[PDB]
Symmetry: C3
Subunit: 374 residues, 3 copies
Amino acid sequence: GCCAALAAFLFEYDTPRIVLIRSRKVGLMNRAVQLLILAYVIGWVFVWEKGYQETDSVVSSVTTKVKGVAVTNTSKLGFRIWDVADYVIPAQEENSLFVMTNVILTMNQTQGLCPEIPDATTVCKSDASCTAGSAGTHSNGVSTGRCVAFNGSVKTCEVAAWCPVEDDTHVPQPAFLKAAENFTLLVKNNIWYPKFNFSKRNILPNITTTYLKSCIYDAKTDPFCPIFRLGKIVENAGHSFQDMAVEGGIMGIQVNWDCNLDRAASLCLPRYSFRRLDTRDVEHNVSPGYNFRFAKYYRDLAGNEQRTLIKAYGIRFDIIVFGKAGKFDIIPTMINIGSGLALLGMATVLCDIIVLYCMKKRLYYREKKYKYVE
Amino acid sequence: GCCAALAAFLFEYDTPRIVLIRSRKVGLMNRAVQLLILAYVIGWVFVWEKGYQETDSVVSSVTTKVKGVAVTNTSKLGFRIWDVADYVIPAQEENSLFVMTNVILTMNQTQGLCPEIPDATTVCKSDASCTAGSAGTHSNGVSTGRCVAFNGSVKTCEVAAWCPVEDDTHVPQPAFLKAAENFTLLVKNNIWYPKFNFSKRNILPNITTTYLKSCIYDAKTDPFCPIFRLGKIVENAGHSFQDMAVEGGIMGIQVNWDCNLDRAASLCLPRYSFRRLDTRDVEHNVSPGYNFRFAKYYRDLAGNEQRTLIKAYGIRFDIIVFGKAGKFDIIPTMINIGSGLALLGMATVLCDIIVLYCMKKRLYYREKKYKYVE
Amino acid sequence: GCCAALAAFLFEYDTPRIVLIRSRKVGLMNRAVQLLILAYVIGWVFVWEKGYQETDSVVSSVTTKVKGVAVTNTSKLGFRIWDVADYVIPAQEENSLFVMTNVILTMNQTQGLCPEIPDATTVCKSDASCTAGSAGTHSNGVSTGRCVAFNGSVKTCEVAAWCPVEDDTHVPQPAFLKAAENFTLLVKNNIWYPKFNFSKRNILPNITTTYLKSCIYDAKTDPFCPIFRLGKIVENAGHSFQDMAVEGGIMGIQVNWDCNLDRAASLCLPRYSFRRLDTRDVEHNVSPGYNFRFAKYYRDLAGNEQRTLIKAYGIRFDIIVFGKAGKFDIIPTMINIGSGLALLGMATVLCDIIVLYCMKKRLYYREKKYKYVE
Ligand SMILES: *[C@@H]1O[C@H](CO)[C@@H](O[C@@H]2O[C@H](CO)[C@@H](O[C@@H]3O[C@H](CO)[C@@H](O)[C@H](O)[C@@H]3O)[C@H](O)[C@H]2NC(C)=O)[C@H](O)[C@H]1NC(C)=O
Ligand SMILES: *[C@@H]1O[C@H](CO)[C@@H](O[C@@H]2O[C@H](CO)[C@@H](O[C@@H]3O[C@H](CO)[C@@H](O)[C@H](O)[C@@H]3O)[C@H](O)[C@H]2NC(C)=O)[C@H](O)[C@H]1NC(C)=O
Ligand SMILES: *[C@@H]1O[C@H](CO)[C@@H](O[C@@H]2O[C@H](CO)[C@@H](O[C@@H]3O[C@H](CO)[C@@H](O)[C@H](O)[C@@H]3O)[C@H](O)[C@H]2NC(C)=O)[C@H](O)[C@H]1NC(C)=O
Ligand SMILES: CCCCCCCCCCCCO[C@@H]1O[C@H](CO)[C@@H](O[C@H]2O[C@H](CO)[C@@H](O)[C@H](O)[C@H]2O)[C@H](O)[C@H]1O
Ligand SMILES: CCCCCCCCCCCCO[C@@H]1O[C@H](CO)[C@@H](O[C@H]2O[C@H](CO)[C@@H](O)[C@H](O)[C@H]2O)[C@H](O)[C@H]1O
Ligand SMILES: CCCCCCCCCCCCO[C@@H]1O[C@H](CO)[C@@H](O[C@H]2O[C@H](CO)[C@@H](O)[C@H](O)[C@H]2O)[C@H](O)[C@H]1O
Ligand SMILES: CCCCCCCCCCCCO[C@@H]1O[C@H](CO)[C@@H](O[C@H]2O[C@H](CO)[C@@H](O)[C@H](O)[C@H]2O)[C@H](O)[C@H]1O
Ligand SMILES: CCCCCCCCCCCCO[C@@H]1O[C@H](CO)[C@@H](O[C@H]2O[C@H](CO)[C@@H](O)[C@H](O)[C@H]2O)[C@H](O)[C@H]1O
Ligand SMILES: CCCCCCCCCCCCO[C@@H]1O[C@H](CO)[C@@H](O[C@H]2O[C@H](CO)[C@@H](O)[C@H](O)[C@H]2O)[C@H](O)[C@H]1O
Ligand SMILES: *[C@@H]1O[C@H](CO)[C@@H](O[C@@H]2O[C@H](CO)[C@@H](O)[C@H](O)[C@H]2NC(C)=O)[C@H](O)[C@H]1NC(C)=O
Ligand SMILES: *[C@@H]1O[C@H](CO)[C@@H](O[C@@H]2O[C@H](CO)[C@@H](O)[C@H](O)[C@H]2NC(C)=O)[C@H](O)[C@H]1NC(C)=O
Ligand SMILES: *[C@@H]1O[C@H](CO)[C@@H](O[C@@H]2O[C@H](CO)[C@@H](O)[C@H](O)[C@H]2NC(C)=O)[C@H](O)[C@H]1NC(C)=O
Ligand SMILES: *[C@@H]1O[C@H](CO)[C@@H](O[C@@H]2O[C@H](CO)[C@@H](O)[C@H](O)[C@H]2NC(C)=O)[C@H](O)[C@H]1NC(C)=O
Ligand SMILES: *[C@@H]1O[C@H](CO)[C@@H](O[C@@H]2O[C@H](CO)[C@@H](O)[C@H](O)[C@H]2NC(C)=O)[C@H](O)[C@H]1NC(C)=O
Ligand SMILES: *[C@@H]1O[C@H](CO)[C@@H](O[C@@H]2O[C@H](CO)[C@@H](O)[C@H](O)[C@H]2NC(C)=O)[C@H](O)[C@H]1NC(C)=O
Ligand SMILES: *[C@@H]1O[C@H](CO)[C@@H](O)[C@H](O)[C@H]1NC(C)=O
Ligand SMILES: *[C@@H]1O[C@H](CO)[C@@H](O)[C@H](O)[C@H]1NC(C)=O
Ligand SMILES: *[C@@H]1O[C@H](CO)[C@@H](O)[C@H](O)[C@H]1NC(C)=O
Ligand SMILES: *[C@@H]1O[C@H](CO)[C@@H](O)[C@H](O)[C@H]1NC(C)=O
Ligand SMILES: *[C@@H]1O[C@H](CO)[C@@H](O)[C@H](O)[C@H]1NC(C)=O
Ligand SMILES: *[C@@H]1O[C@H](CO)[C@@H](O)[C@H](O)[C@H]1NC(C)=O
Ligand SMILES: *[C@@H]1O[C@H](CO)[C@@H](O)[C@H](O)[C@H]1NC(C)=O
Ligand SMILES: *[C@@H]1O[C@H](CO)[C@@H](O)[C@H](O)[C@H]1NC(C)=O
Ligand SMILES: *[C@@H]1O[C@H](CO)[C@@H](O)[C@H](O)[C@H]1NC(C)=O
């Protein structure tokens, strides 16, 4: 009878048979282990580590602006002005901004043949050591194989390059644009959690326009002003701005958006920290500091090309936005509940071992617990 | 006998003893709860949320190109041409592209001393309010401490800057390059899932060269043409291009690559949406819109430096590529199967509570279920 | 008595009753399935796939520098020098670097009216086909509606553009800057795992300054030199540099930082691979290769604007840094242990099916296992 079998399946309840052993020590140990498992599963997995939540990584867009002007007026270059259009190269970058702090300039370079800067490698005599096509470490020009006179006292290998070649052996000390220490950087950050489709920007709802006109970030007094002074950025990373400005470097401004979207959106707040991203190691490094070369191009009255070559040392400020949002989800919750239910059986296993192998009456309990089918 | 014990361990099967209670209500409730747990575990965890899959985040590379030219011919600037080399600054960017839509120009600036633009802060009389070294909000020059004549009717504080200083108090209305509304942007996207080592590009296999010569993206008619009109990009985000072009802004073009790699690769398709990334808030904002300054550098016949300063307003288009791929994995599958097996015992727990504490014959069932070892 | 009930709850141990069936086949199958589940849970989940670890994605910062100079000296352009400031456009980029390998130049362009380059679309006669405002495919200028003479033998539509218009119909072959094959690229990479707060850079502790002065990356001999030759980068991706240099392309240099932070930090090492990111498909592509336009701006003696337009073909090198770190965590460990404990019951289920439905004495075992409460 299939119908009778189905009715029996539906209208009967099956529960296991249990043996109740009266022992203070074993019972207390069983309860202690069960309490130890429950405390783990609740306090650590759920309350502490939030095992009931799904997570999503942040999607960020950043806008950066620098303010400040430096005035130098020396003999070689004369009176010079350095505003934002002069010391920010290139005009725009993604999640980054370079500020020039030291400079070496070479004005009126033309394409042609010229001697190199005298040193151990380039200095020559009799046009014998020079090798055609050898660019050398400079890699600024291609050697023509001839050995010409740099000046009245030394002879160097001739190269095909923009001439005269740059001389970068004397980096200015202190940094040329050392006034950049008091420039200020604004960081505007818009974040997005696509999974929860949640958006926020780092200028909080209580941060007004009047306040943003004169604020400077401070970890204690102004923890949410998005305007940072460069010297203070370097100082908060554990370094010195004047030391770092001579040869340049990389500075990380990292924004943490760890948020709990179970609570009010007003508590999803950014946290700022600062970390130097380049390393000082004179024995395990190549191209220390931070610099690059760019040029300004001109034209002679006859149409011949001329350029000013700039070797720009400076600090690159990288904006690093990271963080995870969390919202309650039923799948991790049920996974953890089932895991705890399964783990509650380790107490039974351990107590069975004790009852059956480390007891005086273990044979009696073995007889009571196990039935041999014969 | 160790061998006898091992044989007993290997050649015996152990199964629990079960009590079968005949009750329609309790049995039906047991089956209902078991069915409720099975339906959860299958339908929600496996079928709906794909709990049998491992996931991997996308690695993306983007190439962007703009097409279009604008012709303006006014009195101050005369006849001007704006092609791609003029309104895209810088020539290249990563996952981004800036299009200039409004402009303020200052031609023939030289480094020197000049008065500021008259306003409440800068206007002065008798050379008393001026403070040396105070850059002011302009931060375009350093105040020299002298109060000089801007013109015949007002006196302002003298600054060391590129002179004459920029006057950005009258932003053109409507936008200067308002013809950028009909420029078109091409977005080429190559994606990579390293875990599954799967690659695809957003130009699908059925998208031909002839079609790509004249297509424009439409959510309904051309959902896979990677060529977007700028005005339409802004419109699909819920905004107006002409309004946004006066002061600039940030526009997000986000590409979603949510794919199921259990199926054919032909179904891994990109989905396009548009979202404005900057905020309009006159009470809780600093530096609204989007603009930056860059310069073109020239040289006098005597070698003196001159520059044209450009304050460029425009819209930055950010390409945001996100998504996760999914493939069947055995580890999550077995974790979910074990979790469901463990969770099936909640029905037993609940039915035991009912049988032992909320029944008329609960004492009889308690006697039948539990054995006291004495 | 509540106290008596509590004492009974605390001082009693409950364990299930078991039926022991003596059968070689069923017992052996039970043990085989249990061993098969244990081998899975240990070997695959724990030992092989490291199911006892939490993971974290890498946060990376990259610095790139190119070295090399090319000398060309032809008739149209004359003697030219191309150093780093000439062929890297823009001076700086994020996680990227473009090297120019082919070039088309247009010198002395002025804003005005000029004919187009003769072709099927532009050629005209009698000033009838020309349409005012139609930018055309060139989109370099706006058509004025007039049909003027390109030269003595053909007439084309007049446009408002920078004049004369660029002629990009003859891309140089072989590439103009084909000497870029032996340029070298340095990639400095600093990584950070915020969850474990672990930092490392790709210049390893045993990589000295003397070694870095002359090393070139090789997968077999120098697997940790961060200096790559461009031609070799393209070759290791399965392509030819000279072929790729004519029209340009995108090359991916991907750094893998898969590390196990349970072990010494000295074993967290970078792995380098190379993949071309652009596709060759003459039937399913738009804008093949890789190129962009930028200009150098000059000024006439009268102050009129002039520019040199450069169409730059080249290879964009993208630095793709990915990887996950792993450290032992107790939560995944306990989840997997509980899952295995739950999964160990499938053996009992299967063996019960066999014992109760596929046995000669199945009725006797059914009587021994199940108790009917009456
Ligand atoms: C805008 O709303 C935010 C969110 O609540 C306010 O942030 C709060 O700012 C105060 C100080 O401005 C913080 O108190 C400080 O705590 C540190 C210890 O970390 C202590 O050293 C300082 O002396 C000071 O007491 C407060 O912690 C912070 N709230 C949170 C949740 O971080 C903010 O004040 C509001 N207004 C502005 C202008 O930001
Ligand atoms: C190339 O292959 C793709 C992949 O199948 C084709 O995509 C399909 O495109 C059609 C229209 O071109 C879509 O139909 C449209 O559906 C919307 C509703 O979302 C409706 O409003 C429209 O009127 C139209 O019926 C179709 O959904 C879409 N397939 C998928 C899976 O999204 C494409 O058509 C092929 N050819 C080209 C030139 O893209
Ligand atoms: C610095 O420390 C690293 C870390 O151990 C050293 O890496 C080791 O480099 C050698 C060769 O320089 C590798 O051996 C090579 O193995 C390949 C097979 O993949 C074989 O084809 C080669 O012939 C060679 O035997 C070795 O695998 C590698 N160690 C690891 C863990 O990858 C490095 O040598 C040290 N010094 C320098 C200058 O890098
Ligand atoms: C996220 C966490 C996941 C884990 C969740 C765990 C929830 C599990 C609930 C289990 C409920 C146990 O339910 C209760 O168990 C005890 C033993 O413990 C039973 O009690 C039984 O054994 C005890 C101990 O020997 C005897 O004193 C008693 O006479 C006998 O009835 C109760 O009759 C039953 O009502
Ligand atoms: C190749 C030769 C064979 C290789 C053999 C591989 C090893 C096989 C032995 C694995 C034995 C697993 O042992 C199995 O453990 C579970 C608990 O997990 C016991 O389960 C029983 O007792 C435990 C406590 O002891 C309770 O928590 C549980 O509710 C109850 O059902 C089973 O009665 C036993 O069969
Ligand atoms: C991803 C999902 C994970 C969860 C997977 C769950 C699979 C578990 C399979 C369990 C199989 C149960 O197997 C079947 O159980 C029923 C009770 O339910 C037993 O039936 C027993 O109890 C019932 C109910 O009181 C009585 O009517 C019957 O006389 C008695 O034999 C069957 O003898 C056994 O064959
Ligand atoms: C400090 C003082 C002590 C602190 C004590 C901490 C709490 C300890 C009590 C936790 C009790 C857990 O209770 C335990 O639950 C499981 C189900 O999960 C029961 O398990 C038994 O009955 C349930 C249904 O009721 C079945 O699903 C299961 O197959 C069967 O083995 C155990 O018989 C019981 O011992
Ligand atoms: C990450 C992995 C997670 C899974 C971990 C599994 C650990 C579980 C440990 C279970 C321990 C089982 O513990 C052991 O089980 C066997 C059966 O297997 C019991 O043995 C019982 O059944 C066998 C088989 O019919 C009989 O031969 C024997 O007379 C009887 O006592 C032992 O008395 C008990 O000590
Ligand atoms: C709408 C009509 C009703 C819809 C019904 C939905 C289906 C309900 C039936 C699901 C039955 C689940 O069946 C349940 O399986 C577990 C194992 O998983 C059995 O559990 C028992 O036997 C198995 C082996 O067979 C052992 O591993 C386990 O330790 C023991 O407790 C239960 O005795 C049985 O009740
Ligand atoms: C920059 O410094 C130079 C001197 O180093 C200044 O030029 C001199 O200024 C003094 C004081 O006014 C005069 O007496 C000299 O005649 C000036 N010329 C020289 C060659 O010394 C110069 O003025 C400074 N820059 C500015 C903007 O004033
Ligand atoms: C950055 O600004 C500080 C002031 O905030 C400068 O230090 C002060 O300079 C003035 C002169 O301009 C002195 O009178 C003060 O004694 C200095 N110290 C303080 C605490 O005010 C500092 O020189 C600036 N950095 C530069 C110019 O590189
Ligand atoms: C830009 O507009 C100006 C006028 O605003 C044009 O110059 C005038 O054009 C008219 C019509 O041909 C002439 O009669 C005038 O003599 C021109 N000069 C002036 C000062 O008005 C100018 O032609 C326009 N740009 C172009 C490219 O044509
Ligand atoms: C962008 O293009 C549209 C056309 O697609 C321009 O609007 C049309 O302009 C022409 C004149 O060129 C008028 O005759 C039409 O009536 C206009 N509307 C339509 C629907 O065609 C629009 O002006 C352009 N945007 C600019 C120039 O900023
Ligand atoms: C670039 O090539 C040209 C010729 O193609 C060189 O100019 C000629 O060089 C020869 C050999 O010295 C002379 O005899 C000719 O008088 C030169 N002029 C011409 C018009 O041919 C030129 O020298 C080469 N570039 C450099 C830097 O030498
Ligand atoms: C890149 O460098 C290689 C050498 O490493 C050049 O090939 C050699 O060129 C020299 C002449 O300069 C010849 O004598 C050799 O026979 C060539 N082969 C070898 C194996 O040395 C190659 O021409 C360079 N690429 C360029 C110039 O595009
Ligand atoms: C020539 O140059 C070298 C190196 O710069 C220098 O040491 C030497 O004094 C110079 N000779 C003269 C006469 O200036
Ligand atoms: C996310 O929420 C915003 C605000 O409610 C809404 O405009 C947007 O469409 C939402 N995104 C999705 C994918 O629904
Ligand atoms: C550029 O063109 C102008 C006229 O437009 C001419 O006067 C000048 O000489 C030219 N210069 C060059 C270098 O071709
Ligand atoms: C001087 O400049 C101010 C501000 O631009 C202006 O209001 C005033 O009319 C000017 N004076 C003369 C005589 O033009
Ligand atoms: C991924 O697949 C492609 C195409 O089959 C292959 O060229 C590449 O080597 C694969 N990657 C790995 C890591 O095996
Ligand atoms: C630049 O050099 C050229 C010769 O190469 C010379 O005629 C010109 O006067 C120089 N100009 C400057 C500003 O040095
Ligand atoms: C005019 O230009 C066309 C296209 O460049 C060319 O074919 C033709 O020969 C030219 N005419 C003369 C006389 O050079
Ligand atoms: C990470 O470790 C470094 C080195 O010990 C330390 O300077 C830094 O503060 C640590 N980060 C955190 C968040 O503790
Ligand atoms: C630029 O200004 C200088 C004086 O500073 C003057 O000699 C020159 O003619 C001006 N040129 C233009 C184009 O305004």
